[PDB]
Amino acid sequence: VSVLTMFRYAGWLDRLYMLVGTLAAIIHGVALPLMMLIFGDMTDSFASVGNVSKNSTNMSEADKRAMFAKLEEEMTTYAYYYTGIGAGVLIVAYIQVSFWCLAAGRQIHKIRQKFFHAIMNQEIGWFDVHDVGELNTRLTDDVSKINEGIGDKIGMFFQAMATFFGGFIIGFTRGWKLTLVILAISPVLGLSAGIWAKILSSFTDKELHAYAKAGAVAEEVLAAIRTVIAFGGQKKELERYNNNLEEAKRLGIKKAITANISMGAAFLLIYASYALAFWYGTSLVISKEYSIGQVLTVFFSVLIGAFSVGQASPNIEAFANARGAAYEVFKIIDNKPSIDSFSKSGHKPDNIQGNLEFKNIHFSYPSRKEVQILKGLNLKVKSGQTVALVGNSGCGKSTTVQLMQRLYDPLDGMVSIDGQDIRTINVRYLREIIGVVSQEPVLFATTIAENIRYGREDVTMDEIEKAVKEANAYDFIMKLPHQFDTLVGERGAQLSGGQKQRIAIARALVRNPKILLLDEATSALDTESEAVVQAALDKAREGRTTIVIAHRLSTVRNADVIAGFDGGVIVEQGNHDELMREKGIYFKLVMTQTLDEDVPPASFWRILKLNSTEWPYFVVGIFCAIINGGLQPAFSVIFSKVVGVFTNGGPPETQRQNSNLFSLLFLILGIISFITFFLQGFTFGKAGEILTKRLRYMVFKSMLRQDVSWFDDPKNTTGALTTRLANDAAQVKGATGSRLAVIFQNIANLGTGIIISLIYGWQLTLLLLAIVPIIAIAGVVEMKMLSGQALKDKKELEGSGKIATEAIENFRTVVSLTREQKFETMYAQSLQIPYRNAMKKAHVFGITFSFTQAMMYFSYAAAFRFGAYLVTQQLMTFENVLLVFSAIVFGAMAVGQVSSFAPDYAKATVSASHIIRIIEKTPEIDSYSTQGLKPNMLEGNVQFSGVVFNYPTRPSIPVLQGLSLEVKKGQTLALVGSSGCGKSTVVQLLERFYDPMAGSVFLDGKEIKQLNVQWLRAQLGIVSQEPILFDCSIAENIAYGDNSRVVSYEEIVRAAKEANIHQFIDSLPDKYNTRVGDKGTQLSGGQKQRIAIARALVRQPHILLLDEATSALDTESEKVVQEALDKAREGRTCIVIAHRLSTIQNADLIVVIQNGKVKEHGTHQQLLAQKGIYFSMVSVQA
Ligand SMILES: [Hg+2]
Ligand SMILES: [Hg+2]
Ligand SMILES: [Hg+2]
Ligand SMILES: [Hg+2]
Ligand SMILES: [Hg+2]
Ligand SMILES: [Hg+2]
């Protein structure tokens, strides 16, 4: 079912090219061993010449002619063969790559449109359940994975098995024993991979749990940053994060060490197998004469067949993970379970004037177990009326409105519009006959003309005009620039909410429904605009049967009929007077209410500087890189010598020669290889480990010691910072790894390859390095062109995805239903551009890889043609021919190196650039000295003079302009302003979060500028709006060590005693030792505030600061907390900016701050006796 068959579905003509491409992938994979079968045949003919050169030379003139004639024949075979295979792999590569794009393109585009349709066709279900909107984005990433699954990855898979099965085929066919030997040594290679699976996979996960502790500490500190800053508890958070880092690093070292050990054993088994393969390959020639040394290399090509399984595994994982992600959700992704709504058919009533009927309706939202919110209902409103509903116990009114649009089919009973059931009539038509003005208006990002046009697609500006005129929306739009062509700026949030709703009214007005549903449309709006929108609603009524729910009973007064519920069942119904008459529910309520990142700057060799500072010395790492570096070419020399004594050499000692080279190849390569992998792993493992620690430490610490809009007003976030701390330090660990990688391959290829090249017949080196770097560049340009396509594709789907996410995230598109098909139609038109683009990139993806494989034969071409033949005949021996393989494999060796181990620099360098720019910091105000703390400074009189300030946004209309205040010690400084900030900013400047732009601020009369940054924050009573405690024992929270300040039990006792939180301290288990229970989820606001107050008065500040402390709070809690504050303050300087003017009535100096400039100031009775702003504030506060 869904696992295999369904995944590939449809694609009638697609499947044909799918199979053609598959076939070309097969013959492509087949091509590689055939090129290597040729290699054994070419070796034999090439071999026979050397035998006469060493031994006989009986006749001379004959050999210079005939042997080379034979060589020329081999030149002819060389030429038609490498070429035949080359043209083959060129064509078939272009085809097999054409497979992804051509098949997957149509498959995925079909998936895309069907997915978008099923998504819009599930209706209610999507908003009720699943991941609540955030899911289908991820899902379009899933269809992107689908795109990755059915692509050429499969073609590569068949190619791989073709090289595998075909490799072993040729192996068995031209001899059967060595294949068998290699297969016997083969499972050993699979066992070594077992070290990988147990240790490596586990230790990644092991280390993560360790740093998880470090992440939690870093998570909260950076979120609680202004609090820890204000209290200066930084160095302690420093300490915790350092301990957790200390554990995470030791799990890091075990990971690196073991990893390198594993890869090391892998190479052991590789050189071991390679050698044993030579021992049995050699045993078949000298004392036997089966192989002439032809097949011996081809049987190694059977090892290329062994590499083909390793090349196969990722493609399967690419198919499976794409398959698995798609098919499990594909049944849910696609089709249409639906059938409570759908889109189509049904019954069309044309009578269009009717009576709504609710009959015995029992319903529960499909949250299931929730008790029926509506259990039974009977309500019937005659045509032309306006019915108003009210309730107490909750939901159940909104439910009836929800049911009326058939958003939910009732469990029992029926809703009948006119005489017909609602379930008979067409859903689309039903939605079209029912207009709805919701409590929360919504405007799509488009013109107001289009937002209306979403009400009805086919419409003209005359109807738009009459619409807004009828919605009285024709005023603000005219004054608004661009008129009807006026965009809704910054997505859909631009203008007044009353205007938004009013526009929504015009939109529903174009709909011209005979039923109008108003759910709290007036709610959450200012009273004036409330009355305006209300007027629009009133002009929209009486021509339409309607139902209105709101919490302002003034609008409920003029309703023809009002309905009470209390538990979901209808109880009272009738005219207003009748309801007040009943002294019921209505009368009861009436009387009751009376991660964008990455700046340009780059490291430039500065990485190794921080490394060397934290990497004290390691010459053993680089030395290990040298001996492994020189280890690879030893192989190329040895291998040359193996076949070397077979071609050029005499009959005696050949057996011994093979034994010696076998053993030399085994221990000299394999053992030393184990040594170097375990040694470097032992070096760079601890190197990168401690680098990751010291880096993460000095980062989190460089971060905590700087604030200044990195925290106060950042474009950053807590998560981005934690991410910085983890990932980046891991990357600089790779940055350090690349150094050793570079010196290693430096001596490994260039140095030894060149030195060895000096002993050549010359001439070969130049031609060889005229190839390898070029094909290397071809490998670079392949990845680059690849990323260019990835980016352009992602940008196109980006735009289509943006407008798609716009559709799916807004569920109200269903209330008009006009936009159901309209949105996916436009989106279809959006998806159209990349589709046509796909065939073009089909050729792009297609021709490139073909050309890449076109370099396969050309490498072998220039190699053996010019290598053998013409270079041969003078100064050419058993070496320098196989040394071709040396310098060639050396280039490939580097490839192996670059495409493995540490990250491809890049991200490492960049992450390093950030982690470095962060550790450099911008210390500004940090700790240092800056003052002496005269004992006599305990006064507390805060001066402000000519102070201007702006948060770091220049044209933000700065909150401080020309501001000056004063407060004497031991007295209350009241503060009042319009709302929000400029209130708080004074407090922040006193906290010295930022030193003001101009003017000055004083505490004892000294300038804050000249005051100690720390000691200024040493006496402050700062208590914020929403108090946040360090996660710790509440006793330990109460006492925050400033510097040397010890945890004092009797002191924190005095703290609780003063804060009146001692109530909870007395009771509850452990008393003071009760922890807050995961960020104080067990405590209410009054308690948290009491504790925060205790945090303040432990410090014994001469200055207390309250920023709208009781603003968010309620009932008695405000009084007991205010009482605590009052017993804490008035003995010392305090500033209360709270918006509560009833408790501000007792103050020494009340200050009204307008626009940066203090307007009025004086005691309550003084300003109140006066008249102006303050008097307005109290009069409207009442
Ligand atoms: Hg593709
Ligand atoms: Hg509910
Ligand atoms: Hg090494
Ligand atoms: Hg602000
Ligand atoms: Hg804590
Ligand atoms: Hg106060």
3-state secondary structure 174-203: HCCHHHHHHHHHHHHHHHHHHHHHHHHHHH
Q: Report the run of H or E that residue 959 belongs to, with start and end.
A: none
Distances (CA, A) of 693 to 211, 252, 612, 920: 11, 10, 14, 17
CA distance 487 to 495: 11
CA distance 41 to 47: 10
**Residue 392 annotated in ligand binding:** yes
Query: DSSP character for 541?
Result: S
Is residue 1080 within 8 Å of residue 1088, measured between CB atoms? yes
Tokens in use for 768? 């060889």
CA distance 661 to 674: 19
Backbone angles phi, psi at 347, to 5 degrees: -105, 135
Q: What number of H helices and E strands is found in the chain? A: 43, 18
Tokens in use for 705? 């010691």
Amino acid letter, 386? T
**Residue 977 annotated in ligand binding:** yes
Ligand nearest to the CA of 622: 3
Give the Å distance between the CA of 1070 and the centre of ligand 6. Answer: 33
Q: Look at the block and give the residue holding tokens 């106060």.
A: 712
CB within 8 Å of 260: residues ≥ 6 apart? 677, 678, 680, 681, 682, 685
The sign one gets for the Cα dihedral 279, 284, 286, 287 is: positive
CB within 8 Å of 418: residues ≥ 6 apart? 349, 351, 353, 354, 355
At residue 520's C-alpha, the angle toward residues 514 and 522, to 5°, is: 95
Cα–Cα nearest to 1113, from 1133, 1132, 1093: 1093
The sign one gets for the Cα dihedral 1039, 1041, 1047, 1049 is: negative
SS3 of the chain: helix, strand, coil, percent, to 5:
60, 10, 30
CA distance 465 to 472: 10
Is residue 238 within 8 Å of residue 700, measured between CB atoms? yes
Q: Look at the block and give the residue holding tokens 């006066």.
A: 1170
Ligand nearest to the CA of 973: 6
Give the Å distance between the CA of 582 and the centre of ligand 2. Answer: 28
Q: Report the run of H or E that residue 413 belongs to, with start and end.
A: strand 412-417
Amino acid letter, 823? F
Cα–Cα nearest to 33, from 299, 309, 311: 299
Give the Å distance between the CA of 1002 and the centre of ligand 4. Answer: 22
DSSP lists the bridge partners of residue 374 as 363
User: Based on the number of CB atoms within 10 Å of its own CB, is 593 exposed (0-12), middle (13-18) or buried (19 or more)?
Assistant: exposed
CA distance 995 to 671: 65
Is residue 883 within 8 Å of residue 756, measured between CB atoms? yes
Report long-range pairs for 1040-1048 (Cβ below 8 Å, ≥24 apart): 1040/231, 1040/233, 1040/1095, 1040/1098, 1040/1099, 1041/233, 1041/236, 1042/231, 1042/232, 1042/1018, 1042/1099, 1043/232, 1043/1014
Ligand nearest to the CA of 1031: 5
Cα–Cα nearest to 263, from 685, 656, 753, 844: 685
CA distance 1086 to 1120: 8
User: Based on the number of CB atoms within 10 Å of its own CB, is 556 exposed (0-12), middle (13-18) or buried (19 or more)?
Assistant: buried
CATH code, 346-594? 3.40.50.300
Give the Å distance between the CA of 200 and the centre of ligand 3. Answer: 20
CATH code, 1-345+595-930? 1.20.1560.10
Tokens in use for 20? 């053609």
The sign one gets for the Cα dihedral 1099, 1102, 1107, 1110 is: positive
Ligand nearest to the CA of 367: 2
**Residue 419 annotated in ligand binding:** no
Distances (CA, A) of 471 to 720, 821, 1016: 46, 27, 58
CA distance 213 to 247: 9
Outline which parts of the chain fall under CATH 1.20.1560.10: 1-345+595-930
Taking only Cα atoms into account, the Rg of the chain, rounded to an integer number of angstroms, comes to 40
**Residue 391 annotated in ligand binding:** yes
CA distance 638 to 1058: 86
Cα–Cα nearest to 883, from 718, 1002, 752: 752
The sign one gets for the Cα dihedral 266, 269, 272, 273 is: negative
Give the Å distance between the CA of 893 and the centre of ligand 1. Answer: 28
DSSP per-residue codes, 328-396: HHHHHHSS----SS-SS--B--------EEEEEEEB--TT-SSPPSB-S-EEEE-TT-EEEE--SSSSS
Distances (CA, A) of 100 to 846, 854, 923: 9, 20, 54
**Residue 393 annotated in ligand binding:** yes
CA distance 382 to 417: 10
- Bridge-based pairing state of the strands 515-519 and 545-549: parallel
Amino acid letter, 340? D
Give the Å distance between the CA of 1126 and the centre of ligand 6. Answer: 7
DSSP per-residue codes, 823-858: HHHHHHHHHHHHHHHHHHHHHHHHHHHHHHHHHHHH
- Fold that domain 931-1182 belongs to in CATH: Rossmann fold (3.40.50)
Give the Å distance between the CA of 1032 and the centre of ligand 5. Answer: 4
Tokens in use for 920? 């450099």
**Residue 523 annotated in ligand binding:** no
Outline which parts of the chain fall under CATH 3.40.50.300: 346-594, 931-1182
Is residue 33 within 8 Å of residue 167, measured between CB atoms? yes
**Residue 398 annotated in ligand binding:** yes
The sign one gets for the Cα dihedral 437, 439, 440, 441 is: positive
Is residue 155 within 8 Å of residue 99, measured between CB atoms? yes
User: Which strands form 1157-1162's sheet, in the order they lie side by side?
Assistant: 1103-1106, 1133-1136, 972-977, 1149-1154, 1157-1162
Q: Looking at 100-152, list the stretches that DSSP marks H as alpha helix, in order from N- to C-terminal side.
A: 105-121, 124-128, 135-149
Give the Å distance between the CA of 216 and the centre of ligand 5. Answer: 11
Cα–Cα nearest to 716, from 708, 238, 795: 708
Resolution in A: 3.8
